[PDB]
Structures are given as C-alpha cells and as structure tokens.
A paper describes a structure:
Insulin and lysozyme were used as test soluble proteins.
The first protein used for this purpose was AlgE, an alginate transporter that resides in the outer membrane of P. aeruginosa. Because the crystal used for data collection was long (150 µm), it was possible to collect all of the required data from four separate locations on the one crystal in the IMISX well. 20–30° of data were combined from the four sites to give a total of 100° of data. The crystals, which belonged to space group P212121, diffracted to 2.4 Å resolution with a completeness of 90.8%, a CC1/2 of 0.62 and an 〈I/σ(I)〉 of 1.45 in the highest resolution shell. The corresponding electron-density map was of high quality and the model was similar (backbone r.m.s.d. of 0.599 Å over 403 residues) to that obtained using crystals harvested from IMISX plates with data collected at 100 K, where the resolution was 2.9 Å. The data-quality and refinement statistics were comparable between IMISXcryo data and the previously published IMISX data obtained from 175 crystals at RT. Dimannuronate, a surrogate for the alginate polysaccharide transported by AlgE, was included with the protein during crystallogenesis. The expectation was that it would bind in the electrostatic pore midway across the β-barrel through which alginate is proposed to pass en route to the extracellular space.
Residue numbers in the entry: 40 to 96, 122 to 192, 202 to 440, 455 to 490
C-alpha cells in the first residue's frame, strides 16, 4: 500500500461561539476533505506525503499536510526511528502535542522504555516571526499497562505579538518568550479503548516556568481583536487526573479532574499549553477521540478547573458512543480562561464557567468508512453573566471514506 485516499465529508454546526453576545459565532456548513497520501519504504528509509484538498461552504484550499523522511537504521530497536519533515507529533493525551509540524523528531519506543526527543518549528502551514519547540519524554512501563514518565517541553519565541487593536487569526501567536513545561505522568491504560484492566487511569502534574508575553483578546464583530499583552515571569501548574471503570468489554464510565492554574497581574501563575496540543484523546476509552475539555467549550488548560463524568459504549469495532459531562470553573475569577471554543466575555468575580454534555457516536464500516457525530452542548455559567443563550453547541457529522 504505497498510496491511498481519505475522503472526509463533514458538516459543522456551531451556535453560538460568543453565547449570543456578539455578531458572529455561528456555523451551519458542509465540507469535503480529500487527503491523498504516498508512503514509500526502502529498508531503514521511509518517506511519506499526505496532501490535503479542502472545500467548505469560501474555505477552499490545498496543503502538504505531511511530508517527511524517516531513518530507522541508527539502532537495531524497531521502535527507534528519526523522523524529519512536516510530521504528526502526537502524544496520547493530545495535551502537549497533537499537530502536524516541521520537526526533527527522534522516537525510541520499547516495551519497558519510551523516549522522545525532538525540535519543531513552523516555516509555513503549506495551505493555499517564528517559535522553536524543543521537547522530550522518557516513560517506563513499570508494570503491564502501567506507565510512569517525565516529559519536557521548551518553547523559544524571541518574536512579538499582535499590537492592541490589531486582529488575531488562528495562525497568529498568542504567546512569546522562553517557557519550559516539566511534567510527571503516570497512566494505566489511560487512552486504551480495548483495555485488559477493570480500571484505567491517568495522572499528570506539570510545572510551567519561564518568561512569557501573551495576548489578551476580545471579539469585535466575529474578529478576534488584541486588547493588550501580559508580560511576566511564569510559575504555573497543570494537573489532569482520571479514572475510567471498564464495567465490561462494552461499557465504560469514569471521572476526570484537571486544573490549569490561573492568576497574576501579568499571568504569573497562569498555566498554558504549548500551542501544539489538540486536547483530543480516547480518555472515554473508545476508538473515537473526544475533546478532553468539551467539544463545545474546547478548554485549554489555562486558569481552568474541570470536573468530568463520562459514560461510554464500544460495540466490537462497529460502534462507539461517549456521553461526557464536564463542569468548568476558573481558578482566578479575574483572569481569562483557556478555551478554543467560546470567545464570550467573562464577568469578573465569577468562577462558574459552565457545564457541558458531549456526545460522540460513531458507526464504523469495513465496507474503510465511518459515520461520526461529535457534539458538545455547553450550558453557560455565571462567569458569562445574563443575556447569553441558555446553551451553545458545536456538532459535527463526519462521513469518512478511507481508500
Ligand atoms: C450540515 C449541517 C451541519 C451538521 C450538524 C450535525 C447535525 C446534528 C444532528 C442531526 C443528525 C443526527 C444523527 C448524526 C449521525 O448521522 O451520526 C450518527 C451515526 O454515526 C451513528 O448512529
Ligand atoms: C527526586 C524526586 C522527584 C520529584 C521531583 C519533581 C518535583 C519538582 C519540583 C516541583 C515544582 C515546584 C516548584 C515550587 C514553586 O512553586 O516555587 C515557586 C516559588 O518560588 C514562587 O511562588
Ligand atoms: C518531501 C519528501 C517526502 C514526500 C515523498 C512521498 C513518498 C513517495 C516517495 C517517491 C518514490 C516512490 N516509489 C516508491 C514509487 O518509488
Ligand atoms: C525526494 C523529493 C520528493 C519530491 C516530491 C514533492 C511532493 C510535494 C508536492 C507539492 C504539493 C503542494 N500543494 C500545496 C500544492 O499541495
Ligand atoms: C522531507 C521534507 C523536509 C521538510 C523540512 C522540515 C524542517 C524541520 C527542521 N527543524 C529541525 C527545525 O524542525
Ligand atoms: C533519553 C532521551 C530522552 C530525554 C528526554 C528528556 C526527559 C525530561 C527530563 C527533564 C529533566 C528535568 N529534571 C529536573 C527532572 O531533571
Ligand atoms: C506521579 C505523577 C502524577 C501526579 C498528579 C498528582 C497531582 C496532585 C493532585 C492535587 C490536585 C490539586 N491542585 C489544587 C493542586 O490542583
Ligand atoms: C460516574 C462514573 C463512575 C461510574 C462507575 C461506577 C462503578 C461501576 C458500577 C457497576 C458495578 C456492578 N458490577 C459489580 C456488576 O460490575
Ligand atoms: C443544525 C444542526 C444542529 C445540531 C444540534 C446538536 C447539538 C449537540 C448535542 C450534544 C449532545 C448532548 N445531548 C446528549 C444533550 O444531546
Ligand atoms: Ca454571536
Ligand atoms: Na531502529
Ligand atoms: Na477503556
């Protein structure tokens, strides 16, 4: 299989990203994502290319999603390889990195020890100032399916931010500086959708230090507008804890707790994620990756506390369903929260961000095809005040064909 084609037909429904407090924030659009790919393997050499042709109801583009060359001949370890090019950098939680980026990444994956060491930097986004990311991890499977690892991420950004009044696109920097994340992780089939254990867990504690400049934004008629900048020394903490009960081979239910520290005049104790994260994982124990902090809220571990309750059902490799409840609060009731899904203004003094009920339902067909519903229903809390819509939703219907 030197080539193939993924055809994703998606329908997104977004109402309303600003909770009905600003013009914009709505979507009811369809799109086609055509991802031709080319994989070649000549011994220890392996080259891959994935293209992307997207047309949505406007947003019409072409991109080189992945383009890498890989060398596996440094060591006899079949899990050891050096990947160079625009590659997928993903760790199981999606909380450090889950993105396609030009990187020089070294993997060493053995049953007892896992180790990664890479450098990533965007030179383009290959669609129709910069940041250096330096990272590494070392984990040990101390007991079957039980892991304990330390993870490091450094972001070097000598760049600058959009000035107050200017608009901020998604391709823009929201932060600069020198930031080191040092995390301690322990997992027991944390993201294993087919687990041999009645209990799965994840437990992560991360320390963020450094110098950081970061944007403070607002929304002005569907446009993200820079309102200023926080310039400080960072000393922040992030935590994610979860327990998943595998009631049986189909039924799962679990609890989660995460906290991304918040606060400080210039965000001294405000935790943040690397900016390479997707926050998508199989934390509900299904094949379907669910947004860890709601499909609607799209929380980013930054001045955020999240309590999660989830129920899931996986039928063989045919069906999966995940019902996810989250309650969101800020740590500091005068700081902004990390969210990629809600841009509505927050009323100072109010900790209660909201509540969310997510449903992810997928039907798989070997017919190489899947029909997925990923939807978040967010109930705005007191932090967003009165006048807001009683609820917000983001729902997607994906129809994927893999050839
Ligand atoms: C083009 C409009 C944007 C799409 C918004 C999503 C529509 C939301 C709800 C209505 C459809 C409900 C059924 C979803 C579906 O077909 O997937 C479920 C299926 O995979 C397994 O039962
Ligand atoms: C050998 C034992 C392994 C455990 C070592 C891993 C834990 C190390 C450090 C935890 C980071 C805590 C940082 C303490 C801190 O908040 O100091 C900042 C303070 O000066 C400002 O309030
Ligand atoms: C920019 C380098 C990575 C992109 C290359 C895409 C992988 C295919 C390599 C071309 C050779 C194919 N083959 C096997 C037919 O010889
Ligand atoms: C060994 C060198 C391999 C050369 C193959 C080059 C493949 C890249 C294809 C460019 C496609 C870019 N885009 C954006 C138009 O899709
Ligand atoms: C095969 C195509 C290679 C694409 C260039 C990737 C540049 C990555 C460099 N680095 C080390 C900064 O990540
Ligand atoms: C064996 C190559 C992998 C190296 C990856 C780096 C792992 C992170 C360890 C950071 C060191 C911090 N400290 C204070 C714990 O020593
Ligand atoms: C061995 C790595 C796992 C460490 C995770 C445990 C973190 C401590 C839990 C307390 C959470 C409370 N708080 C307020 C600090 O967020
Ligand atoms: C809210 C998420 C946590 C729910 C998990 C509750 C534990 C499983 C209860 C089922 C126990 C019955 N049993 C023994 C037949 O398995
Ligand atoms: C025009 C399309 C409208 C899409 C409506 C879908 C709302 C998202 C539902 C999230 C799941 C929560 N639940 C269980 C209450 O349905
Ligand atoms: Ca609106
Ligand atoms: Na190797
Ligand atoms: Na599971």
């Amino acid at each position: 299989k030197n080539f193939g084609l993924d055809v994703k037909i998606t329908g997104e429904s977004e109402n309303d990203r600003d909770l009905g407090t600003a013009p914009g924030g709505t979507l009811n659009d369809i799109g086609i994502d055509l991802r031709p790919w080319a994989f070649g393997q000549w011994g220890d050499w392996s080259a891959y290319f994935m293209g992307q042709a997207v047309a949505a109801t406007d947003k019409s583009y072409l991109a080189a999603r992945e383009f890498w060359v890989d060398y596996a001949g440094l060591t006899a370890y079949p899990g050891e390889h050096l990947r160079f090019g625009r590659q997928r950098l993903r760790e199981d939680s999606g909380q450090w990195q889950d993105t396609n980026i030009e990187a020089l990444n070294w993997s060493f994956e053995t049953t007892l020890l896992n180790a990664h060491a890479g450098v990533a930097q965007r030179f383009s986004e290959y669609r129709t100032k910069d940041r250096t990311h330096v990272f590494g991890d070392i984990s040990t499977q101390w007991a079957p399916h039980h892991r304990i690892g330390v993870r490091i991420h450094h972001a070097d950004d000598s760049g600058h931010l959009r000035r107050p009044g200017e608009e901020v696109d998604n391709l823009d920097k929201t932060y600069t500086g020198q930031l080191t994340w040092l995390g301690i992780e322990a997992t027991g089939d944390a993201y294993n959708y087919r687990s041999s254990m009645p209990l799965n867990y994840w437990a992560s504690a991360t320390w963020l230090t450094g110098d950081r400049d970061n944007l403070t934004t607002t929304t002005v008629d569907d446009r993200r507008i820079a309102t200023g900048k926080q310039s400080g020394d960072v000393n922040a903490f992030g935590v994610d804890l979860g327990l998943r009960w595998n009631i049986d081979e189909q039924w799962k239910a679990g609890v989660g707790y995460a906290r991304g520290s918040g606060g400080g005049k210039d965000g001294e104790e405000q935790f943040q994620q690397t900016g390479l994260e997707s926050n998508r994982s199989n934390f509900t124990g299904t094949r379907s990756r669910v947004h860890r902090f709601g499909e609607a809220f799209r929380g980013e571990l930054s001045n955020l506390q999240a309590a999660t309750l989830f129920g899931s059902w996986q039928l063989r490799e045919d069906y999966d369903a995940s019902l996810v409840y989250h309650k969101f609060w800020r740590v500091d009731d005068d700081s902004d929260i990390g969210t990629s899904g809600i841009n509505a203004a927050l009323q100072p003094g109010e900790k209660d961000i909201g509540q969310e009920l997510d449903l992810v339902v997928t039907k798989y067909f070997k017919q190489s095809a899947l029909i997925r519903f990923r939807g978040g229903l967010f109930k705005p809390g007191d932090a967003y005040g009165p006048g807001t819509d009683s609820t917000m939703h983001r729902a997607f219907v994906d129809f994927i064909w893999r050839f």
